[PDB]
Design a protein around this ligand. Structure first.
Ligand SMILES: [Ca+2]
Ligand SMILES: [Ca+2]
Ligand SMILES: [Ca+2]
Ligand SMILES: [Ca+2]
Lengths: 324, 327
């Protein structure tokens, strides 16, 4: 078990144990986003699993965020069960609190409400003066959404809170972290986060682009009508390409194609000149090969479908490419 | 559900659905390494969640590998519940089979055995001729460990199988993939992989923590100096103040546990550098000795410069360092 301040990556999730002096804590990391925690007589303790970012992109540039979770939550004293994180430039510590122990945070006057995820959240902005932060001892704003009533499972549509805060004038910087978190303050407690799944890029409109409508390049690329209307790529350098306006940062690419024969045909996906994966057509029979989870960023960028491993034993036939 | 060939990364795990023509299949991706799968009347189908690699490193270079899993496994015909993957240069498709449907793979004559994970496995080397691979239609070797009887949960110490294979002259190339897999052949079936955790860099055979005292390190910058309170160690006072030492990394991944403190109630930050690159920041929130750990740092095997350096000083705190421990 973890009993001192630590950061790392555990089954794909960025985890952190943080406390100040006084009392004790214990964190056990389990699979996926899951973990349990226990604390006594602390000053301040945070246990969390989520994702850290490199401080270079807004939540809009990263994509949609949503957390689905469930927890057994047994605080004895002041405590939060919350999504938590930070932004920089400006430096902001933020919370989407679904449950709490003896006190409902954060005090003061609400700036707004949001009804989302079957619940209602009051929205607040506070100030922390000379307190611990990712940038050392500092003075920074806190942004909050706090459920009107307690729950300990469900889905938190993080990006919706973020938009609500920004629409009330609570400006967000480049992202540093989002994570499901158990906080304790001058308390004791235990929690078992038995479910916690953070999804980036989830659905908030497919585009289909016929191969024959794209630009041809290389020595032989040519149109075909069998086994479908499309194009054939016969030799290394044969490719079809088009510019596309990516309005979100992540996509799946689904290419309908086939080999001309029983040998396996390979077609590389390039975005802005960079190899992002290979589509495999094992057969002469039209099939839809999907390369999912490509993080390419928002922008107008060149999509290429290109053959590079031809040796004269197969050709690739392409019907269409769909981007979702 | 996925019902056509697809590759992706789902909840941290590299997943793949692959089938050739005929019949049908369906895969549902759940959290962590988990997934369920169904198939009917296929020729060949594979469902898997694991890790893909960039083909530049051997399993030694990547680290120890181990998978903990459990599955509900209801094949109807030929089928494997197995660890699966590939190397390149040479091209090798490999399997560590724990259960199967009507036929226990892979035929032929064992080259050896290995007792591990409470089980016994026979080891085999076969050849596939003009078959589908990660490099197109090709001819290549397959390496196998096959359990002498069926099991659908537990731990598979992948790296021990790999060493067993190599000790028998079955040489492995750079890694492309390791993954828990459900394969069907000329069959139907279903399976629910309700647990599947792939661990890279876990402990293998009483490897020891190394502790290096800050005061024995090489000092750099304008003021670095030794201290005896609140412990024996060094103080770093201004930007560029650092302590450094070559360390001989014999595996590719480490945790770094620095025992330190601020001189006061302000937060002290000390940057970790390995081989001239920034690998993280240790935080000491107050004046009391604490152990801050940065875990899961992949530096690669080799003799590399470790530096502990102050870069964010503004005259409001100093960093006190007792020792650094690498594990
Ligand atoms: Ca060709
Ligand atoms: Ca077409
Ligand atoms: Ca200083
Ligand atoms: Ca010391």
């Amino acid at each position: 078990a973890i009993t001192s301040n630590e950061i790392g990556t555990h089954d794909g999730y960025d985890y952190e144990f943080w406390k100040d002096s006084g009392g004790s804590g214990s964190m056990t990391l389990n699979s996926g986003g899951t973990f349990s925690a226990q604390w006594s007589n602390v000053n301040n303790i945070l246990f969390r699993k989520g994702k850290k970012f490199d401080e270079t992109q807004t939540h809009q540039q990263i994509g949609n965020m949503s957390i689905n979770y469930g927890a057994t939550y047994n605080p004895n004293g002041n405590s939060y069960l919350t999504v938590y994180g930070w932004t920089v430039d400006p430096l902001v510590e933020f919370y989407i609190v679904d449950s709490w122990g003896t006190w409902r945070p954060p005090g003061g006057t609400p700036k707004g409400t949001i009804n989302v995820d079957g619940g209602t959240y009051q929205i607040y902005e506070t100030t922390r003066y000379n307190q611990p932060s990712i940038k050392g001892t500092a003075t920074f704003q806190q942004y909050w959404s706090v459920r009107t009533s307690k729950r300990t499972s469900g889905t938190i549509s993080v990006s919706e809170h973020f938009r609500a805060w920004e629409s009330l004038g609570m400006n967000m910087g480049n992202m540093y972290e989002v994570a499901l978190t158990v906080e304790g303050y001058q308390s004791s407690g235990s929690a078992n986060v038995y479910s916690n799944t953070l999804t980036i890029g989830g659905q908030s409109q497919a585009t289909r682009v016929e191969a024959e409508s794209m630009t041809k390049g290389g020595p032989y690329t040519s149109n075909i009508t069998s086994p479908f209307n499309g194009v054939a790529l016969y030799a290394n350098g044969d490719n079809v390409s088009f510019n596309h306006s990516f309005t979100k940062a992540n996509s799946s690419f689904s290419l309908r194609g086939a080999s001309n024969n029983s040998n396996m045909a390979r077609v590389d996906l390039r975005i802005g000149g960079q190899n992002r994966g290979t589509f495999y057509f094992g057969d002469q029979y039209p099939a839809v090969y999907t390369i999912n989870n490509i993080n390419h960023g928002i922008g107008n960028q060149l999509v290429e479908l290109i053959v590079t491993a031809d040796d004269g034993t197969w050709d690739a036939y392409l019907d269409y490419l769909e981007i979702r």
